[PDB]
Design a protein around this ligand. Structure first.
Ligand SMILES: [Cl-]
Ligand SMILES: [Mg+2]
Ligand SMILES: [Mg+2]
Ligand SMILES: [Mg+2]
Length: 775
């Protein structure tokens, strides 16, 4: 550890060829995504054999005895899998194969063709149905399986196909079907668009076709389902229905997907994945183009996965809310009123979709601004839902286990967005992201623009390049620390890597090396100043040191004890090196501004020193006032933020994020740091807890702690708004301040009062800065 560990590191990814390879990946990715955000190749989605077979049913509109779309028949005949089923070969899901195979077998029979495919299709259905012993064996269910399959299977039964119609599992499905159909308002199907419009082909005996057009989508589809739309068409001859089938055939050629379009959801999944992989900074233009389009279609009623959906979708709406707000678009969490009742519902659709909706709601809820009570409710509700989902047997289906759903859920619940290490989360996601990820709706499908090899390849490479660059910086850091004189103060612990990590883990970009470096010097100085003021020094010594702080005269230190003479000199050098760099970057005078900041900080320390010497316990108001200034986060933050390559902060601009006395970014960080620190430790002079109990003699320790959190929680919402707020402050500066707060919040998370876990601090440095991703 320390100097020796760091200088032994030898990362290959520093060589310029790796960055050059990464730039080819970036260009290839932009080319791949171009049709999805700029062109017309939108909605890239795999075939649905099940839906294709429904479209193949439509008889020629000229009245002749052939299909209107004979290419779909040809497709089906040519795409049977080796086991006799239809579906995507890479991923086997019983309900998907059962539904799709029975659908294809029936359409082939209609047109009197593919006798061999039909024979093999029937064998698969019969064979696999007889393997189901109990419920646990059915696996994950595609959308509305319980409703559609009994209906489709009755159709087969009327044709007397050789299927096991009398199996227990079959009877169970009918039972489940009746159960779903009971809670159904029939009269409302025609008045209020609902999830069931996605599967009309499964409830033909219920639907009055002459009334169903009122809930048709503007593009002629029924909830974007080709199968469902085709069904309505054969019953009504509706022209807009036909136009929708035509548009889908024109787009895909000889097949259809199970959802079309998916323009809104797809765009958001692309951005989500790019962001979580840590590679967003390469694709600013594409992310703006994607989100601008989503925002154009953002409305008070929420959004569906496609822009023409007649009803909003919680999964897509919650994802959109989060990404839009995260990217500084103005959205209101009142859109979640659309998914309420007399509160929330979303306990109806297919399981994976329901879980995805609640994960997205849970995540969106963490981006709350002050006074946004509905997000507080959303959080509670989503948390409760997700905790229950873990206890559900569906969560442990073979399919869900293969995708580690329970792990994803558990990880989501233990993960607080505010208390996160950004570089570490991206690293972890590169380890979970799947190029061949399969999703569920009416059938199993993939979105190749969202899930592919290139994303991951760039993700891993980019992470390793960034990390190797940081490893070289850590050599400079440790090299500087060693010759700095700081190691001489043996009453203070040496933590240069921990302070480096504090900034590098959030502000990682290669151009901000000077920012990380100066930040690390100041934090190293501060830990020594801190131990000097609250532990090592005597009041009389500290009065002398505090006086020299006021004078800014090196010659004046002749009065000080030897150890303080040295401390003053290092302090004086570091302050003025930071100042010089800042003036270089900013092009204006900043020495006076920095000196004032250091004065306030250390006078704060001295006031605290006087309190200790007098065994004085301040009121909580006094404690907080002093603690915001003396915790020293402010002057530390300024020492990094004013020296970010190419980021100009006028005085006016700076005062929007730094202004002692106001609730701006640096002030909120100071307050949050002080209190998150107290809540984390305090048990191990006097803290905020102890101060409240002096102010309120009768209150318990529990009441005292609870009150501290009542100050914390609102502060964190304000931090979030100040960060994301639109303004004329360089966003990179705001992000630096925010990300430093986030890493701080990781360090002090879960405040039981015992103290900080030093062992986990090290593990974070290891994961983030030491060990690369395997390629
Ligand atoms: Cl998968
Ligand atoms: Mg202290
Ligand atoms: Mg201390
Ligand atoms: Mg402490």
């Amino acid at each position: 550890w320390g100097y020796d560990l760091v200088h032994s590191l030898k990362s290959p990814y520093i060589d310029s060829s790796y960055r050059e390879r990464a730039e080819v990946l970036v260009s290839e990715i932009k080319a791949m995504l171009n049709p999805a955000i700029t062109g017309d190749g939108e909605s890239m989605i795999t075939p649905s054999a099940y839906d294709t077979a429904w479209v193949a049913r439509v008889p020629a509109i000229d009245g002749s005895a052939r299909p209107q779309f004979p290419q779909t028949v040809d497709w089906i005949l040519k795409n049977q899998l080796k086991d006799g089923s239809w579906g995507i070969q890479s991923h086997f899901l019983l309900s998907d194969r059962l539904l799709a195979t029975l659908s294809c077998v029936l359409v082939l029979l209609k047109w009197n063709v593919g006798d061999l495919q039909v024979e093999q299709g029937i064998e698969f259905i019969k064979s696999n149905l007889e393997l189901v012993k109990d419920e646990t064996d059915q696996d994950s269910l595609v959308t509305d399986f319980e409703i559609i399959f009994p209906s489709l299977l009755r159709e087969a039964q009327s044709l007397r196909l050789g299927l096991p119609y009398d199996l227990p599992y079959i009877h169970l499905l009918q039972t489940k079907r009746q159960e779903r159909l009971a809670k159904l308002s029939r009269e409302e199907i025609y008045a209020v668009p609902s999830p069931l419009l996605y599967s009309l082909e499964g409830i033909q005996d219920i639907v009055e076709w002459e009334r169903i057009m009122e809930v048709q989508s503007q593009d002629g589809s029924f909830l974007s389902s080709p199968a469902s739309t085709a069904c309505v068409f054969m019953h009504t001859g509706d022209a807009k229905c036909l136009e929708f089938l035509n548009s889908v055939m024109i787009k895909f050629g000889n097949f259809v997907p199970c959802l079309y379009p998916v323009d809104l959801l797809e765009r958001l999944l692309i951005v989500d994945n790019i962001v979580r992989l840590g590679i967003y900074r390469h694709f600013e233009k594409e992310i703006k183009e994607a989100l601008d389009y989503v925002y154009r279609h953002w409305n008070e009623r929420g959004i569906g996965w496609g822009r023409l959906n007649p009803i909003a979708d919680l999964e897509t709406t919650a994802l959109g809310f989060r990404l839009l707000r995260l990217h500084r678009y103005n959205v209101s969490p009142a859109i979640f009123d659309n998914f309420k009742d007399a509160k929330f519902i979303c306990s109806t659709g297919q399981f994976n979709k329901d879980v995805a909706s609640m994960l997205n709601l849970y995540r969106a809820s963490q981006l709350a601004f002050p006074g946004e009570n509905i997000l507080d409710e959303a959080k509670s509700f989503a948390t409760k839902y997700l905790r229950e989902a873990l206890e559900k047997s569906e969560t442990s289906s073979a399919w869900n286990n293969k995708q580690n759903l329970s792990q994803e859920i558990k990880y989501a619940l233990k993960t607080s967005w505010h208390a996160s290490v950004p570089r570490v989360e991206a690293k972890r996601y590169c380890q979970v992201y799947r190029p061949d990820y399969a999703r569920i709706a009416k059938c199993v499908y993939k979105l190749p623009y969202v899930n592919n090899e290139k994303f991951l390849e760039l993700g891993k490479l980019d992470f390793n390049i960034i990390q190797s660059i940081h490893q070289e910086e850590m050599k400079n850091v440790t090299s500087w620390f060693r010759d700095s004189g700081l190691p001489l103060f043996t009453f203070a612990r040496e933590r240069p890597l921990e302070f480096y990590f504090l900034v590098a883990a959030g502000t990682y970009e290669p151009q901000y090396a000077k920012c990380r470096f100066l930040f690390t010097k100041v934090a190293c100085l501060q830990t020594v100043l801190d131990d000097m003021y609250d532990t090592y020094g005597t009041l009389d010594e500290l009065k002398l040191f505090t006086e020299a702080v006021r004078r800014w005269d090196l010659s004046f230190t002749e009065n000080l004890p030897d150890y303080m003479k040295l401390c003053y000199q290092i302090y004086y050098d570091i302050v003025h090196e930071v100042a010089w760099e800042a003036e270089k970057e900013q092009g204006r005078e900043l020495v006076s501004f920095f000196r004032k900041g250091w004065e306030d900080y250390l006078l704060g320390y001295y006031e605290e020193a006087e309190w200790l010497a007098a065994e004085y316990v301040p009121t909580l108001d006094e404690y907080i006032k002093n603690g915001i200034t003396s915790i020293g986060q402010r002057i530390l933050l300024l020492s990094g933020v004013l020296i970010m390559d190419g980021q100009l902060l006028s005085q006016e601009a700076l005062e929007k994020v730094d202004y002692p006395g106001r609730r701006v970014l640096t002030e909120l960080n100071s307050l949050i740091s002080r209190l998150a620190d107290d809540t984390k430790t305090y048990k191990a002079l006097a803290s905020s807890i102890e101060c409240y109990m002096k102010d309120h003699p009768e209150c318990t320790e529990e009441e005292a702690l609870d009150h501290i959190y009542s100050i914390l929680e609102p502060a964190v919402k304000e931090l979030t708004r100040e960060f994301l707020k639109p303004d004329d402050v360089p966003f990179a500066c705001k992000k630096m301040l925010f990300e430093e707060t986030r890493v701080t919040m990781v360090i002090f998370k879960d405040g039981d009062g015992f103290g900080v876990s030093k062992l986990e601090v090290k593990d974070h440095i290891k994961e983030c800065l030491i060990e690369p991703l395997p390629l």
